[PDB]
Amino acid sequence: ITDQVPFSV
Amino acid sequence: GSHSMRYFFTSVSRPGRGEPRFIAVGYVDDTQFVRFDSDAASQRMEPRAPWIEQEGPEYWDGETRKVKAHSQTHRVDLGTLRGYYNQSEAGSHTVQRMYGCDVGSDWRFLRGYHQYAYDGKDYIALKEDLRSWTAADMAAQTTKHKWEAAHVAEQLRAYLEGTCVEWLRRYLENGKETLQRTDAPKTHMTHHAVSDHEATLRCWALSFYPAEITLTWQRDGEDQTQDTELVETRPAGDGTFQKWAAVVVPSGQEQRYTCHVQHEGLPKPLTLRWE
């Protein structure tokens, strides 16, 4: 499974 | 015996032709198992391997919601990156992200990774310790500052050492037939004249899995790496891989040349000869 929502750059 | 899970995400802006294109894929080792495509009709994370199909509706609903959320964050990122680099509105740009975990033969966590690229170049990446960042240029230092203040690394480390490893184990067990196999290469060499004084010798490896393989030519035992044409390992489309390496040699000297094949499915590395 994927990780949770990535933090924006 | 070693294993990996990796997710790959690509977003491409197309200014004045709609929202950015987003494609996500997930692999265990060299076997793809999920995809999402922003341009496709379903708007769902979809299975791409038989053994992930048994995952229930909560898995597919949840993975669809998360991957759409990744897609939205990259949409924001494309805007942000254009500001960081003072780039114009209209050109197409690319953000890529890859992350995942490796385990050894005993299936315990070995390493984790989480890497980002903008326009084909390293932008920012988690270091080996999963506690710090390597930022490739000045704009990526801005991201590093923001990610440090937001404690991004700690949240990623918990995934990469925990969840990522746990789910890789589950996939390796559910997909055991596919994923815990080794198919040794079927090897041979071909010989063709290119003129009356030179011949191409091409060393082949077919039907192998996993994709990692080494093919090398020797002349009287000396490696001929500058004179070898080595093609990229390529999929057969059936879950196995192919590769070849070739040299062009003076006719009459074939017996000096040997091809050497290393693959985890071979009990011993093979040496193929013209005599």
Place this chain on the structure above:
Amino acid sequence: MIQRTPKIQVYSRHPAENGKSNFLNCYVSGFHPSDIEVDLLKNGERIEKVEHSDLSFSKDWSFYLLYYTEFTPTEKDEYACRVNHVTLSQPKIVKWDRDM
């Protein structure tokens, strides 16, 4: 901006035997950016029934895609793959050579 040229390989899934169904592959790897046009050709004409893999990329960020179609080789039919990409000044045609 970085640009990397596609490495194009055209080949069959199994050793070709006239009259036996098989798959014709065009594998394009090592390219950047991702926008790419790939067609399989039969006697110089575009094959319609062509599928492709989902866009992915390597450790060095360069993209790869597999284009493929089921086919039954014969003596006379000639196969190829035609590829256009920003790094190519004109589309490049690589012919299928079954005697490699």
